[PDB]
């Protein structure tokens, strides 16, 4: 069998809370009035929902409405419970209301509106400083949610709303998030391919908050190297091959051995033998202004196969890459 694992931080936070904090199947939903909201226009479509801009006609406020497609009752309550537990936390989107849509007869979550700067434009005109600033802001959201016993499990650029004009960032889409419990085996079929931690790719189910720290490293690498996505896999197997061509195969096999992981035999014919590369090989004239010794040191400490050896959010926030941002924010 695989060797068990516990988070190194915030291990027992949910155990020390009353059961109703994390026992979301027992949550009863508070329904608002659906007639308070008039849809203005469609913003997005997905496997699990459609998202609209709306107006609250009661106070004339602009709002965002997520109308769910069919999803298990318990996962609806999971997303709602997590959003309520995290309300008022730094850089976490606020759930403002929940209503029963009369057309789909399904739940609609009502969120604060963020005036999102176009991802493409923003990602092309970010300064080194801007990246440090916004990474710092994401880390606050992750440290808060992790300290509150919650893993996001879907960190990636499109789940980070940034209003660049107001220097305002919100981490959104808590529909994959879960409560961390020591010893629990979780579904590995989470996160988008390019952001999946190695634990997910080798089917190690006893994972924790550190999953989010891998995803964050993937975002950071793409921003500083201007390479989107950084690990560009063709499928879930080839994703680990792409990681292995950068992090090397030696540390991968040490990871497999240490946790006694049974590797899908498909992998043996494709992983090969690969040295760990130096980061300088992704540095080019066009991205040089975004790369610093500090950034590379920071990145290196996020992107580890061994989930126990990655920086925590709080450690990350203490790294020299953020020394100028921390000083200015005081």
Ligand X SMILES: CCN(CCN)c1ccc(Nc2cc(NC3CC3)n3ncc(C#N)c3n2)cc1-n1cnnc1
Q: Out of 44, 272, 293, 320, which residue is the one contacting ligand X (CB under 6 A)?
A: 44
Q: Does 215 bind ligand X (CB under 6 A)?
A: no
Whole-angstrom distance between the N-terminal and C-terminal Cα of the chain? 50
Q: Does 161 bind ligand X (CB under 6 A)?
A: yes
Q: What's the closest the beta carbon of residue 99 comes to ligand X, in angstroms?
A: 15
Q: What's the closest the beta carbon of residue 179 comes to ligand X, in angstroms?
A: 19
Nearer to ligand X, 71 or 261 (CB): 71
Q: Out of 137, 173, 199, 208, which residue is the one contacting ligand X (CB under 6 A)?
A: 173
Bond into 229 cis (ω within 30)? yes
287: phi then psi, degrees, rounded to nearest 5:
-110, 5
For residue 304, give every residue at least 6 positions away whose Cβ sits within 8 Å of its Cβ, in sequence order, or none: 247, 251, 310
Q: What's the closest the beta carbon of residue 290 comes to ligand X, in angstroms?
A: 25
Which residue is at the shortest CB distance from ligand X?
Answer: 44
110 contacts 98 by C-beta, under 8 angstroms: yes
For residue 126, give the DSSP letter: -
For residue 250, give every residue at least 6 positions away whose Cβ sits within 8 Å of its Cβ, in sequence order, or none: 275, 276
Question: How remote is the C-alpha of 233 from its chain's centroid?
Answer: 18
Q: What's the closest the beta carbon of residue 198 comes to ligand X, in angstroms?
A: 22
Per the listing, tokens 């006893």 go with 206
Site map (CB under 6 A) of ligand X, residues 63-102, x = contact: -x-x--------------------------x---------
197 is in an annotated binding site: no
156 contacts 215 by C-beta, under 8 angstroms: yes
For residue 123, give every residue at least 6 positions away whose Cβ sits within 8 Å of its Cβ, in sequence order, or none: 157, 223, 228
Beta bridge partners of 110: 65, 97
Q: Out of 4, 46, 272, 320, which residue is the one contacting ligand X (CB under 6 A)?
A: 46
Q: Decide: helix, strand or coil at residue 300.
A: helix
Q: Which two tokens mark 51? A: 């998202």
Active-site option among 23, 97, 143, 154: 154
Q: Out of 159, 215, 222, 239, which residue is the one contacting ligand X (CB under 6 A)?
A: 159
Q: Out of 27, 75, 113, 242, which residue is the one contacting ligand X (CB under 6 A)?
A: 113
Q: Is 130 a catalytic residue?
A: no
For residue 92, give the DSSP letter: B
Beta strands of the chain (E only): which ranges?
A: 37-45, 49-56, 61-68, 95-100, 107-112, 150-151, 160-163, 168-171, 178-179
Task: Tally DSSP H helices, then E strands, for the chain.
Answer: 11, 9
The one segment of 8-16, 25-33, 44-52, 128-136 that binds ligand X by CB under 6 A: 44-52
Q: What's the closest the beta carbon of residue 106 comes to ligand X, in angstroms?
A: 13
Nearer to ligand X, 109 or 148 (CB): 109
The one segment of 43-51, 118-126, 210-218, 284-292 that binds ligand X by CB under 6 A: 43-51
Catalytic residue list? 154
Binding residues for ligand X, per CB under 6 A?
43-46, 49-51, 64, 66, 93, 111, 113-116, 158-159, 161, 172-173, 175
Annotated binding-site ranges for ATP: 43-51, 66
């Amino acid at each position: 069998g695989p060797v068990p694992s516990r988070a190194r931080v915030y291990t027992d936070v949910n155990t020390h809370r009353p059961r109703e904090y994390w026992d979301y199947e027992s949550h009863v939903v508070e329904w608002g009035n659906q007639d308070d909201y008039q849809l203005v226009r469609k913003l997005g479509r997905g496997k699990y929902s459609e998202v609209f801009e709306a107006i609250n006609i009661t106070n004339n406020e602009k709002v965002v409405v997520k109308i769910l497609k069919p999803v298990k009752k318990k996962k609806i309550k999971r997303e709602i419970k997590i959003l309520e537990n995290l309300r008022g936390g730094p850089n976490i989107i606020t759930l403002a209301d929940i209503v029963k849509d009369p057309v789909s007869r399904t739940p609609a979550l009502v969120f604060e509106h963020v005036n999102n700067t176009d991802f493409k434009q923003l990602y092309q005109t970010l300064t080194d400083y801007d990246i440090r600033f916004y990474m710092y802001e994401i880390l606050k959201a992750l440290d808060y949610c992790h300290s509150m016993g919650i893993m996001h499990r879907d960190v990636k650029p499109h789940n980070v709303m940034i209003d660049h004009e107001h220097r305002k960032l919100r981490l959104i889409d808590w529909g994959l998030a879960e409560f961390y419990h020591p010893g629990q085996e979780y579904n590995v079929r989470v996160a988008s391919r390019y952001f999946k931690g190695p634990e997910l790719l080798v089917d190690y189910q006893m994972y924790d908050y550190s999953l989010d720290m891998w995803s964050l490293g993937c975002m950071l690498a793409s921003m500083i190297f201007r390479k989107e996505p950084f690990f560009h896999g063709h499928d879930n197997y080839d994703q680990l091959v792409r990681i292995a061509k950068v992090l090397g195969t030696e540390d991968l096999y040490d990871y497999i051995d240490k946790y006694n992981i049974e590797l899908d035999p498909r992998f043996n014919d494709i992983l090969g033998r690969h040295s760990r590369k130096r980061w300088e090989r992704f540095v080019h004239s066009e991205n040089q202004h975004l790369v610093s010794p500090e950034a590379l040191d920071f990145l290196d400490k996020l992107l580890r196969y061994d989930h126990q050896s990655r920086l925590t959010a709080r450690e990350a926030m203490e790294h020299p890459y953020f020394y100028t941002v921390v000083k200015d924010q005081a």
